[PDB]
Amino acid sequence: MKYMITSKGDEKSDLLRLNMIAGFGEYDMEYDDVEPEIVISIGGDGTFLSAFHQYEERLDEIAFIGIHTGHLGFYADWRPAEADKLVKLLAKYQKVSYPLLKTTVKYGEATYLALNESTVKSSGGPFVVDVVINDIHFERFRGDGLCMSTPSGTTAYNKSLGGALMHPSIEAMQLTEMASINNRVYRTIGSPLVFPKHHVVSLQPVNDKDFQISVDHLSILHRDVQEIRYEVSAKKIHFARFRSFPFWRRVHDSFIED
Amino acid sequence: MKYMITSKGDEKSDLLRLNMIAGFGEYDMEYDDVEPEIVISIGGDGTFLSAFHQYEERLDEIAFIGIHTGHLGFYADWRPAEADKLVKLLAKYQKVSYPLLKTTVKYGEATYLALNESTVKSSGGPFVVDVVINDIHFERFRGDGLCMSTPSGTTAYNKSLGGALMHPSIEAMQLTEMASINNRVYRTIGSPLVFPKHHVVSLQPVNDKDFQISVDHLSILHRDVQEIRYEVSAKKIHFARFRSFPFWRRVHDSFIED
Amino acid sequence: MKYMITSKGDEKSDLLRLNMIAGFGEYDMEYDDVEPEIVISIGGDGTFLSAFHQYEERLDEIAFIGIHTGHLGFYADWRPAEADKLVKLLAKYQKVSYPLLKTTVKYGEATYLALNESTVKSSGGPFVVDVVINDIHFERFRGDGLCMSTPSGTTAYNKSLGGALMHPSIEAMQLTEMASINNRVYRTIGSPLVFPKHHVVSLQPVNDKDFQISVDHLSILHRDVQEIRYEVSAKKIHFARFRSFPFWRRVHDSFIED
Amino acid sequence: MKYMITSKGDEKSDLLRLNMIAGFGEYDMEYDDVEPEIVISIGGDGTFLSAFHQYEERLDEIAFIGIHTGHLGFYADWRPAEADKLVKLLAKYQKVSYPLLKTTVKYGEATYLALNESTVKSSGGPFVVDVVINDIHFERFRGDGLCMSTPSGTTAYNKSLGGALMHPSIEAMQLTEMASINNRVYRTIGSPLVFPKHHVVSLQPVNDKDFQISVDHLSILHRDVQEIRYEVSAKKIHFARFRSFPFWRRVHDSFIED
Numbered sequence A, B, C, D: 001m002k003y004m005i006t007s008k009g010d011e012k013s014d015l016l017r018l019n020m021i022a023g024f025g026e027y028d029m030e031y032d033d034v035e036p037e038i039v040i041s042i043g044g045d046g047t048f049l050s051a052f053h054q055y056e057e058r059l060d061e062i063a064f065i066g067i068h069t070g071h072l073g074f075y076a077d078w079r080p081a082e083a084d085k086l087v088k089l090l091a092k093y094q095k096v097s098y099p100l101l102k103t104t105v106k107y108g109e110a111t112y113l114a115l116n117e118s119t120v121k122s123s124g125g126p127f128v129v130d131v132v133i134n135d136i137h138f139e140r141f142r143g144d145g146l147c148m149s150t151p152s153g154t155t156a157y158n159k160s161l162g163g164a165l166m167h168p169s170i171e172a173m174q175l176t177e178m179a180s181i182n183n184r185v186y187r188t189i190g191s192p193l194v195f196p197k198h199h200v201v202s203l204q205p206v207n208d209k210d211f212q213i214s215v216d217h218l219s220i221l222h223r224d225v226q227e228i229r230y231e232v233s234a235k236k237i238h239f240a241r242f243r244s245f246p247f248w249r250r251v252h253d254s255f256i257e258d
């Protein structure tokens, strides 16, 4: 069974990576960073984000595993001291799948897959877009930007904006506002919105058509934008589970105490 | 097919009720407020709430219809001028189901069914409870109270507390905080929490065991409480749909403009 | 110079109280709980709140001192181990004054002095009041209640409701909302409001005239209420300062780390 | 008495400007856009913002007047139909002063005067700064940015971020957070902070020293930044008042109804 390991790049992560590779060598494991079936991330949730996007074209044949060399992450939920215990079991577990968010941009198409969220800002000018939900004009948003988050991504940027945390077993997506203007003439919903599967949220410009669109940690500028389309992707990320680590326990350890 | 009609009690609602009853008399409809299969509510969402709780023992044999004599409600989504058009079609539509919230209270059991939400406060003293999620201690809440809302109830009390609006096709429940205390020694999650089906949220006392527990508009005091249990109910409320009125359009008309 | 000491009532506070009284006996200090000029509070901010209200008729002749036997409080900012050091200096310091909030209730008058805040709720029914600012109708509030806080009280209940923290050198008062309803027909400002000196905020009923009015920790029901009047009081509480303990440092220790 | 008039540039504003200039010609008024003593703004609060910054070097000799050709603004509080009535009285009123915010940037100094607010973001990377209040380390902020607002500016960007509205008679400044990160290891105060006169709020970098600093509508990038200093300015903007238009009425008309 093929595998590969990505490292944060610091001294602790590179050394932990070489010790796991040496451990897998004692088994029948084959290192292959081209067509792997097991992808291990050593570092933080940001390193795991990079590992996910390096193989988003083969998500159905890959089970991800995360190791946090710093603090407890949501995707990297393995202690460095438990690395050798992980090498044995990984060489012969069950698979756990999380939903993902699809982002489509159209000009005068480009699709992206997000694990945390996808946000839209205005390249310098004021951000004004009309929010269309299933071909129905819902609101004209006026403010800093908007954030569409996955279930597992609600603990990231979505949380800082006031969004709700939702369990990853729910196939849904959540949209939250960034510093919206609300006076007697400009009105937005304010509340976060949770959309189920097969619901399409479209963002359409009003004046400016240049938007700073981000997907997870990748932020790239798009010029002459006609529409930004959001929907829950049909593809899912697969994790390799070896023990019981509930999502609500991960939330407790990351935010309450540990 | 049996039916019944509840009225808000004012002049406009009582007159609209008698005109619909006379219209149903022209068909083969039988008025029966004991074992009805069609329950019509004329007034507001509060009147619809009363109509739901009067027949929560026969939810699987009843399709609800709401008429708003005041402003546009979420459950009463029919104009009074469309009443006669409603009488004809209702006498020979499709059924639409929404999930519900189950509330269990234990002393030293009482179950309730909520359409909007179920909240917990403290009878006078300070409100302190431990929040347990699937037999896991998540947080010790310290503040005014807590609110567990249904999907269709997220537009009510849940919205005023900062909760997210979620589409009723999602079988889930959402918990939100009321004026929580957060300093260097008392810590809550703050964010709203969305729980899927088969997840159990338990509230357990610390000192005071008397709580002011509410279900929709019913508020009753409970003494010597041992545990408050929350989970998505297996029973669903059934609406009779005659036209396309999306939930996100109901949200737009109630909060954006109409 | 006369003095008195109030205790939380537990073992640690009562013992610390008797040791300070014995220390003051070694000086020319006279214990008098009737007409004191120095009032020491041993326990928490709640105990300090009680000590303030026991002598609100002689605020101009009393300098308050707080000792926290538990965690760091905002009004009780002295460690128990620093008690003997406090007894010496207190027997021959400078005075520091904080503004207070005045609350007037009228029926068919009763004035109260608050150190933290004064809140208004509805005795069971829904809470609806019109908010009048300097004889100008500002908004019709619809929700759980309202909270008018002093500058030093903004770190208490006001903080849990989203209010801003303001330095006690600012003679002002801050009003915050409790779970307000905001749809297309009911509209409140939502933002907290900071009022300067000589500004009068009046609350007037709409239907129900019975309100659960609270002042600091005292909560008492009022029937047949005509108006609730708010303004910054002309009286100030006086603290005895012996060292530099800035307000922003007290906020840091209570909420960031310590 | 010298005067000048700035226009939004559209057809309605330019025509209203030429009609007022012709009206002032019938009096002893002298048009001078170099050393004026009366500055009239015709358009919106953005146009008024431009008019303020064009003459921030002569604030003590200038009384500002605003005219809104669109909707009711906070600084432009005169209807276009009341223009001729304004020309007569302005040619022989009382002066009203509002406080301002001072912003100092230091490299390896540049001072700015803000009427609404001054915000700090990170030029691309993550925004991390230490917040120092009167030479005391208060918090290490981690998020999108920070916003320091004037009293009259609290109805603008400060409001969208959750800040409190404060009456302009209070000489103070208010700081609010933008999408802060708060987990078990990163902690900010969250609440808005209101600082009185003579209090200094300093922002110091951690890693990145390039910041996108904005003052009102001007946004300019600063490289190799050592410190960002905030304090209530000693200079005040002067308005020419002809009638009673309370601040709380301006808030009502802009946000509640009009």
Ligand SMILES: Cc1nc2c(N)ncnc2n1CCCl
Pocket (backbone or CB within 6 Å): A045, A046, A049, A074, A116, A152, A153, A154, A155, A156
């Ligand atoms: C990169 C990333 N993702 C998440 C996530 N889902 N929850 C919480 N933190 C996350 N991070 C790191 C930001 Cl501190």
Ligand SMILES: Cc1nc2c(N)ncnc2n1CCCl
Pocket (backbone or CB within 6 Å): B045, B046, B049, B074, B116, B152, B153, B154, B155, B156
């Ligand atoms: C009784 C009730 N239920 C709801 C609901 N689900 N959404 C919005 N408003 C509701 N109301 C009436 C309160 Cl105004």
Ligand SMILES: Cc1nc2c(N)ncnc2n1CCCl
Pocket (backbone or CB within 6 Å): C045, C046, C049, C074, C116, C152, C153, C154, C155, C156
């Ligand atoms: C009674 C009290 N007053 C305050 C205050 N001003 N700030 C913070 N905490 C306070 N407390 C105790 C509540 Cl934990």
Ligand SMILES: Cc1nc2c(N)ncnc2n1CCCl
Pocket (backbone or CB within 6 Å): D045, D046, D049, D074, D116, D152, D153, D154, D155, D156
């Ligand atoms: C430029 C500007 N200043 C303000 C202000 N102080 N309050 C409200 N709106 C303002 N605007 C225009 C933004 Cl819509």
